[PDB]
Design a protein around this nucleic acid. Sequence first.
RNA 1: UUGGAAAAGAUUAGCAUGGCCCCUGCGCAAGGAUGAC
RNA 2: AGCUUUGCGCAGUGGCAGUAUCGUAGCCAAUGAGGUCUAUCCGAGGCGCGAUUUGCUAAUUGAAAACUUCCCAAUA
Lengths: 389, 141, 50, 13, 500, 152
Amino acid sequence: IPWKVPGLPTPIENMILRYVKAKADWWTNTAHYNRERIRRGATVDKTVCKKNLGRLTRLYLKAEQERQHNYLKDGPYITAEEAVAVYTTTVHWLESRRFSPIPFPPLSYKHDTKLLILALERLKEAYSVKSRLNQSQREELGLIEQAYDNPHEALSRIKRHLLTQRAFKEVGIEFMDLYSHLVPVYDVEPLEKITDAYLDQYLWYEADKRRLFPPWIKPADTEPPPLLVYKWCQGINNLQDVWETSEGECNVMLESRFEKMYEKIDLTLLNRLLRLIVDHNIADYMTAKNNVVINYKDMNHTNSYGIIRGLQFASFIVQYYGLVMDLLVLGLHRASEMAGPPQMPNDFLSFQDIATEAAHPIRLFCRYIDRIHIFFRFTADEARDLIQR
Amino acid sequence: SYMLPHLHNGWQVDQAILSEEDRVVVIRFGHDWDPTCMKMDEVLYSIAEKVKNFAVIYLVDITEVPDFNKMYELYDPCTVMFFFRNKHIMIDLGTGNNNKINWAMEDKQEMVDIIETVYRGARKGRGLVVSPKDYSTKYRY
Amino acid sequence: KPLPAPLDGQRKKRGGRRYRKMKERLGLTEIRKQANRMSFGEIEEDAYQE
Amino acid sequence: DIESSLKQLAERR
Amino acid sequence: VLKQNPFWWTHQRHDGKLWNLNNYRTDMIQALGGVEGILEHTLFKGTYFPTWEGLFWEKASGFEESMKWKKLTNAQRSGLNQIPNRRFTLWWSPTINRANVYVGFQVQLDLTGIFMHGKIPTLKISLIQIFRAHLWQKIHESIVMDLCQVFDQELDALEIETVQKETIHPRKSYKMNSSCADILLFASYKWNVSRPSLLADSKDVMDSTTTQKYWIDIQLRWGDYDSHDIERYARAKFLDYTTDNMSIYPSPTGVLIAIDLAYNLHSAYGNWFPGSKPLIQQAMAKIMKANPALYVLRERIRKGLQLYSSEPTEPYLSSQNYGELFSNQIIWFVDDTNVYRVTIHKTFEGNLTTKPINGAIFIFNPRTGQLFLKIIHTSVWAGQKRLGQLAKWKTAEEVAALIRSLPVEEQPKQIIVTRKGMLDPLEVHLLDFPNIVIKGSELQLPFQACLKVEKFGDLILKATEPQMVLFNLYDDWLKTISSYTAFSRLILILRALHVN
Amino acid sequence: VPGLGRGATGFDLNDTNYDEFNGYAGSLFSSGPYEKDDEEADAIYAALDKRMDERRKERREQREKEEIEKYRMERPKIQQQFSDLKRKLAEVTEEEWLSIPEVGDGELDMRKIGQARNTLMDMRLSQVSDSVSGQTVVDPKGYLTDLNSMIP
RNA sequence: UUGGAAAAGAUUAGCAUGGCCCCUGCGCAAGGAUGAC
RNA sequence: AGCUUUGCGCAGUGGCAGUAUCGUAGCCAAUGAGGUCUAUCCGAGGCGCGAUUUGCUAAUUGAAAACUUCCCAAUA
């Protein structure tokens, strides 16, 4: 917030500005030192931890505001040609999969009541029985009870908000006090949160029905993470000659993550891509919800280049972005072979045929949430060619 | 800074202790040069406008008025002591004694809670107010 | 931003249709049973249900 | 008032 | 959400419980020494609770609500939150107050036998509050007086001349360094001084030693987990007091008793007088059963530890206790099950008439041949914006208020309720008036026949106002037939009315 | 007047004046009892000490002065920090030093290029998106109008 | 009638008062309708 | 002459009492605060503060829970 004292002497203003700059430098250095000590494992207290967390959150908010301002100044990082090529690839992938778009929720959806009840339950589970609840928390609980009282009216209000409310309120931002990797905690408005949760449940159900998310998208209810690791280990050895290095063959499993994948999500590209899958009105509503004014204490900044993880629709958005990224990385032919024919799709970490398993170096690939892992069994000639390249 | 007016004269400080009776009188015997007394003064300034309606905090310099450091034996660099209507209330910190705080309390909430508890104990007349804190340990981990 | 003085109530002399309505609506009487007992002999819930 | 005391404290530190 | 959930893998209600640690709890209970072994290190023995399965612990319910339904400051909230820590320390105090657990810092509680070998402020505060109002000296004096009275009740047959308590200082009932003699009872004869042995011993050995004056002493101890051996410690104390430098007892054949107040035990390993060892044993057993000061201390200790056994409930009135309700204790057979009086009448078309009827409650006293009907207007039960539990609570409150309207001299000593679940709200509403016992009556009497009467039923239908008008349940048997016969006749009449 | 008038009691040996090394501060010999013979003895002792301290005094002093000059490059006093501002700050006139209110009361268009780039990208994508096959659209006008077609 | 030793007032519940909404009797303003040989 | 309107204030009765009653002292406000009907129509409240104050009685805990002396001994 700018400090404007037009009634103050110019030398007084200069002295105040110099003192402010010195104090800001000292505070930044102290916060960096305290964060380093906390990450290393130094001995601190609750007051020191609280002060360091507050200073780090303020610094992160200022840095995010500066990054958003620079993104607006520098424009979209993604070039037009690259964006067009990515959109063409995604369109080709969707057409090959023949994914019917998920329409807007009809007036007489068969499972609308069930989805609304599930969303209300999933939102209520956060509000555990504590000593008390804030006024906003009390209003949220009251709105949840009212929705559980009149499901039809609540669904009508949700639909009206989805089709009309393209400009939401300010979403709060707080940072979880993780010692190593600080993470944000974004709280949406109560009615906005309810609408987002209903939209997310509907989109997840529609995607499951239409098979939008691919099998290699790892986090699912079918396989828990430890069982996912066990299945990956079991299927790695299931490939033909997965260990025979006698002929010089070498197998390389690359474990990588998409750095700043959540942060570097172009809102315009997200709107242009989600419209190919989600309903155009629903996609526009989700894209608009992705743009909000992040408010925290006396600091308020806008968002234009990063999807908010707090929104209930983040799961579908992040899944679609990860699917697009995987299609770019895995390639059209490899993804098609890994997902099998549309009529009889293949299971996870499985190829339609043994010949189709050795059709390319990429054999096994599990696109976790912002964490890739591809197992490549490069032949001797293929490894030599890749090394030469 | 140090907006709290330090009672330079020892007799002036004693009269100030006899001045207010319906609130809490806290005297900071720390010498203003040391950084620990600076942190104590900062903590007092944090609660300067909060506990004002229930307490009256004054600073003190043991070099200016030595009688307080020679009769009450306040040898700590910055010791916080209380006196309510000519009765030095004792805070049950658990540090062996209860005449002073002797610690640079950097938590404003802790100081506010201690002041409130001291006021409640003085109203109840308990010369040894049970401090709602585990001051016997460093309270850090 | 003043701080409320450390003062409490003086004494209790009223009750019933004058102060009982607030204690029945706002501070409504809970179950007060089947939620405060522990049954130190047996174990109702699981070992780590919490 | 407080200016003199502040200056005195500053001059010794 | 700003709360870190360790169960990020799967949900219990979506994937299912992935573990079952109940066997772990059972194994941890058994491997600690079983329930008895676990409680041995705890203060459950001192609570004198002989039911290791019936006792219930008040989880966060020791106070009213620990002032949670209030607007106290942060310091009061912190104190309330730290209050359970004091209770937890007190529960496991014997396992923690042992001199072999902490360093040697033996400190004895003022005017008490609690020798806290250490400095635990929570447990120290709990022990001080447990012994509030000078309990130790009073308990010792009460034990001495009870022993003297028990002896003097039949002292003449036991060859006792004169029993009088010596001049013992108040500080001689808590200082272990210097002891004295509690009872100085003469025997009027050359009482052969038996060998000083444990009362638990069944050996009848008496050395060639005789005297006239025989002394008896009593000591108070708060044994720890390791100091609970009352017999051996008492024998050692008696041996040390025999050759004590300052405990100058008058009779060298002066027995001494010990009380393990912490572990609820008593022993005596002194010179058991011929024929007095069974007397001392019986006196000690009767005291430990019903010692007044010890009972008060045990009650205070149970209250402090947030432990309270489930008190027995009023028994049901079976076919054998059917006539037991006609005694001088006034019984009002409350049966307001039919209070849900409404008219669900199928209208010709469109809907059904949803018109509630004016209800009522039934209060009749077969023990006195009375009948009082309190009618509940349909307006009170309609449009109040509440569920049926609020209506039941209102009915119970109305019953309690009608009981309060009746004089205390005419308050029903028993309140038989036909509704099973109405006993708890009845007790809660009128806990300030506990002179009425809410006894169960499983066999529900046909008291609803009043609602079908030509006069009573028509009045109940149209009684739009709450009326406490009385009536005579018996037609003429109140002044003509026996009260039990009157109740039988009323039951027969009601059964006939309900039959057809 | 002493502090006894307040009726208060207990519950230069200060801890600041004390230390582990060299014990407490101050001189055990009071500065009072001096004289002309004391002046002569002190002068002789100080002359002897200065003579016995001049072995490496010149080189040590020069090196220390050079080190202080070097440290002046990276060790600005808090006072020095605001010294330049405080020097010019005195130029504020009395009216300027009294009107200070209480604290209780061509050009670069950076966003222009970003907006242009975003518009171009959106136009290119829509041109690409115009080639889509079966992208659906639910008209908000119809849905909102037919929303009340099943209301109570 | 005679005679010897000598919590710094708290917890819990109802009842009326009290607060407002209705009426009544009282007192009266400005009026409103009427009887006046 | 009898009655009565806005009803007022007194006294009695009935009911309500956390959303409510009121000050509202901060602010707008008879010189219009507010809008899906009524939009050339309607015309006086709303945002935030704080409580629901006066007494009596029983009980309850405690050794004592309070209103002008007391435990004692052969008699009178």
